[PDB]
Amino acid sequence: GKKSKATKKRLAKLDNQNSRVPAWVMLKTDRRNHKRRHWRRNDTDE
Amino acid sequence: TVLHVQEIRDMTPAEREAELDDLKTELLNARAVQAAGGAPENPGRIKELRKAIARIKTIQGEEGD
Amino acid sequence: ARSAYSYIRDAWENPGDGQLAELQWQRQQEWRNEGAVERIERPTRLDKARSQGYKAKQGVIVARVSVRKGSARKRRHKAGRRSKRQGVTRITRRKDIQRVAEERASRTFPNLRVLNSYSVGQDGRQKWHEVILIDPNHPAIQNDDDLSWICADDQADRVFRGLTGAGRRNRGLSGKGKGSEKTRPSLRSNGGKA
Amino acid sequence: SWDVIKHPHVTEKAMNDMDFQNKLQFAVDDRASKGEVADAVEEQYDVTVEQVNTQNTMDGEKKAVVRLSEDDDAQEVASRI
Amino acid sequence: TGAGTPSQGKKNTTTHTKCRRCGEKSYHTKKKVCSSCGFGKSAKRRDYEWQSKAGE
RNA sequence: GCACGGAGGCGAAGAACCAUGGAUUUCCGAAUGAGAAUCUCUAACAAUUGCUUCGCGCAAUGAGGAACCCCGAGAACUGAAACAUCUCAGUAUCGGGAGGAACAGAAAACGCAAUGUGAUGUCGUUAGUAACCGCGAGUGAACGCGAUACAGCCCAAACC
RNA sequence: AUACAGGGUGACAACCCCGUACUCGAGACCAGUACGACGUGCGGUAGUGCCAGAGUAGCGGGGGUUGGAUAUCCCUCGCGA
RNA sequence: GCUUUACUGCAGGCUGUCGCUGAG
Ligand SMILES: [Cl-]
Ligand SMILES: [Cl-]
Ligand SMILES: [K+]
Ligand SMILES: [Mg+2]
Ligand SMILES: [Mg+2]
Ligand SMILES: [Mg+2]
Ligand SMILES: [Mg+2]
Ligand SMILES: [Mg+2]
Ligand SMILES: [Mg+2]
Ligand SMILES: [Mg+2]
Ligand SMILES: [Mg+2]
Ligand SMILES: [Mg+2]
Ligand SMILES: [Mg+2]
Ligand code: NA
Ligand code: NA
Ligand code: NA
Ligand code: NA
Ligand code: NA
Ligand code: NA
Ligand code: NA
Ligand code: NA
Ligand code: NA
Ligand code: NA
Ligand code: NA
Ligand code: NA
Ligand code: NA
Ligand SMILES: [Sr+2]
Ligand SMILES: [Sr+2]
Ligand SMILES: [Sr+2]
Ligand SMILES: [Sr+2]
Ligand SMILES: [Sr+2]
Ligand SMILES: [Sr+2]
Ligand SMILES: [Sr+2]
Ligand SMILES: [Sr+2]
Ligand SMILES: [Sr+2]
Ligand SMILES: [Sr+2]
């Protein structure tokens, strides 16, 4: 396909969100990115 | 911190602007050092610079420049 | 003595007789060539307009509107219906043509509010009414003792809520006693049976 | 009011462009044009910009590759920040 | 050719996309109409009383 | 900040925090210069109106809101032990529109017929009464009375 | 104790802490209302057929609706003081 | 769901009449 500038911005955001909960958040909260996505298993919008 | 609201108001319009550029630059260089993963940081300032700039910008509008 | 107005009035009691007859015959030819809503400089029935609230002032507008004559333009049922709800030809709508005309006029002039309206005839295929609309935002009107009431917020889009003289009559609110058990204070509050 | 230069983009590939081709790389505002990037850079480090190439990255930002004139030395500029 | 699995392979057309007005992936890029908020069809927001139980 | 980390910083130049007021407030969005899946292209109240200095100069409209409210459009399942009038029901749902509440409202009324009442909502009652109805199943008021709250006015015309 | 409502605090707490009774303060709503004041000027007699809202009141054809039955309300076509 | 000279209706078509609609 061909992505527009906006599409690309949205895709990029999705990539960023798709990361781990920083280790320090674990300690601070004394003990999961519920939105972890996989390119294959999942399907983004648009 | 180091820069207070009183001080800011005591500057002339030309000084606040000169101070504004001086601040923006320090910030830019901080972000540059942060980009290079440099550790000579002092996270507090990077935070303080942003506020100072908002303060000068807030004063500039209050005084009419 | 009789006012000049009484003469316009008396002429319109028999629009099919005298000079008025010839005028209408002439006019309608031009009206049939005009659009659905034509703003006009002066009322055709001055006595009636002044009687209904019209004034020769800034903020007062008059518009003639034509509507197709006849019953409802209803679409026949595509799904199951008991004989009773299959009719299509003799069913008429619940709003009279004068009311349909007031609403079209008010849609054309979104910023104006309908004050009243009256009939100016019809031919075999359409009816014409003139509608008086007021500019609630013009100071000449905000300062008028006889019309400033129409500037209040709750008078906004008054015609679409039946607050017109034609609206109130069509809603069966004329009588104050017998026969108005289901019309007052509103058709809706009475379960829609009036 | 949004500024043009966000920060120096420093990576192995950036260093090469700096040592071998007198080019500096920056993360810039995606609304900035090549010309606005050249001007902004010249007025922040006092140098002459010869060419600017751009790319809207998969990080949602715009990356610019600024080549300086032979009179300026990328390495020295980058080294003063 | 079956209507099931074999016919699912021909599906590579894009129709519904992220909507500019409401944010849902319901903007039909062919009709240029959002099936969720009505964008492209009406200035008012798409809404219906049947989207909830009658007495609620 | 949630959030019980690490590092660092701010606070007696009285921070945090709270109240009130102000500043900033990207893009799409009624979305309004033209276009577009949130971006782009070359000065913009687009569109419909009113006034008009006839120039977008001054203004209005548009869209939102849990339900409530007003004006329009208006089913069927169902009940009648079938079913067509009737019923479900002016209900569900649809179109339009206002407000903080709406609507109604100062009698061409009532008609306990009177030597009587005296704008209008609403509440209790009148009453499942009168009235309707394959006179089947079912549908179903009003005047009055007791309360709540009370408030009456402005035009058109005559004469100027 | 005019405070024995409720909560917190390492277990059953009026007296450990927040509160609670009493008293006091502010904002919002009531309401730009009520009162008050400014102006305006109510009313009565005699005469005068000067004025007082038309497709209306009303009637008929066809529909819908209503408890409205001859006696509901409305739409529509025609006639019409 | 389908059929028809089943029951009852509804569109639609034909036809008369009134309005549009006037003068000799
Ligand atoms: Cl209106
Ligand atoms: Cl009585
Ligand atoms: K039925
Ligand atoms: Mg990665
Ligand atoms: Mg007067
Ligand atoms: Mg490129
Ligand atoms: Mg736009
Ligand atoms: Mg049955
Ligand atoms: Mg009510
Ligand atoms: Mg039976
Ligand atoms: Mg009923
Ligand atoms: Mg009665
Ligand atoms: Mg019925
Ligand atoms: Na995928
Ligand atoms: Na209007
Ligand atoms: Na960044
Ligand atoms: Na804000
Ligand atoms: Na505007
Ligand atoms: Na203009
Ligand atoms: Na049954
Ligand atoms: Na059956
Ligand atoms: Na029946
Ligand atoms: Na009594
Ligand atoms: Na009825
Ligand atoms: Na009739
Ligand atoms: Na079947
Ligand atoms: Sr797959
Ligand atoms: Sr409106
Ligand atoms: Sr990356
Ligand atoms: Sr085949
Ligand atoms: Sr196959
Ligand atoms: Sr395909
Ligand atoms: Sr459209
Ligand atoms: Sr809706
Ligand atoms: Sr009273
Ligand atoms: Sr009168």
Closest CA–CA distance from residue B9 to any residue of chain D (Å): 22
Strand partners, D63: D27, D55
* Domains of chain D from N-terminus onward: 1-81 (3.30.70.330)
What resolution, expressed in A, was reported for this entry? 2.2
Angstrom distance (rounded) from CA C21 to CA C14: 8
Do D and C make contact, counting contact as 3+ CB pairs within 8 angstroms?
no
Name the token pair of E20.
Answer: 């500019």
Q: What H or E segment, with its residue span, contains residue C82?
A: none
Domain residue ranges in chain B: 1-65
Q: What H or E segment, with its residue span, contains residue C60?
A: strand C60-68
Nucleotide nearest to C52 (CA to C1'): F156
| Nearest-by-CA chain D residue for B36 | D10
Asked whether the bond before C43 is cis by omega within 30 degrees of 0, the reply is no
Angstrom distance (rounded) from CA C126 to CA D26: 73
**CATH code for position A14:** 1.10.1620.10
Cβ-contact C133, C181 below 8 angstroms: no
Question: What is the phi/psi pair of residue B62, to 5°?
Answer: -60, -45
Owning domain of residue A37: 1-46
DSSP three-state, residue D52 = strand
Closest C-alpha to C166, from C101, C78, C111, C108: C101
Contacts of B33 in chain D (CB under 8 A): 81
Angstrom distance (rounded) from CA C138 to CA C123: 36
Look at chain A and report how many structural domains it folds into: 1
Owning domain of residue C148: 1-194
- List the determination method: X-ray
Strand partners, D54: D64
Angstrom distance (rounded) from CA C25 to CA C123: 9
Strand G close residues, chain C 36-65, CB < 7 angstroms: 48, 51-52
To the question of whether residue E15 is assigned a binding role by annotation, the answer is no
Contacts of D27 in chain B (CB under 8 A): 35
Q: Are strands D49-56 and E33-34 parallel, antiparallel or unpaired?
A: unpaired
- Judged by its nearest atom, the ligand closest to the C-alpha of residue E43 is 33
Q: Are strands E25-28 and C60-68 parallel, antiparallel or unpaired?
A: unpaired
| Nearest-by-CA chain D residue for B29 | D81
- Burial class of C85 by CB neighbour count within 10 A (0 to 12, 13 to 18, 19+): exposed
Task: Give me ligand 27 centre to Cα A17, in Å.
Answer: 22
Angstrom distance (rounded) from CA D48 to CA D59: 28
Question: What is the phi/psi pair of residue C25, to 5°?
Answer: -55, -40
Angstrom distance (rounded) from CA E37 to CA E35: 6
Cβ-contact C112, C134 below 8 angstroms: yes
Please name the residue that has the structure tokens 């000084």. B15
To the question of whether residue E54 is assigned a binding role by annotation, the answer is no
A16:D59 CB<8 A: yes
Topology of domain B1-65 in CATH is Helix Hairpins (1.10.287)
DSSP calls for C165-186: HHHHHHTT-S-SSTT-TTTSS-
The E residues from 9 to 48 touching A (CB cutoff 8 Å) are 14, 17-18, 25
Cβ-contact C164, C102 below 8 angstroms: yes
Q: List, in order, residues 6 or more apart from E46 with CB less than 8 Å away.
A: E34, E35, E36, E37, E38
Amino acid symbol at C44: T
Look at chain C and report how many structural domains it folds into: 1
Cβ-contact D3, D27 below 8 angstroms: no
C1' (F77) to CA (C80) span, angstroms: 12
Crossing angle of helices B43-63 and B13-35, in 10° steps, is: 150
Q: List, in order, residues 6 or more apart from C114 with CB less than 8 Å away.
A: C102, C105, C106, C131, C132, C133, C158, C159, C164
DSSP three-state, residue D74 = helix
Topology of domain E1-56 in CATH is N-terminal domain of TfIIb (2.20.25)
| Nearest-by-CA chain D residue for B28 | D7
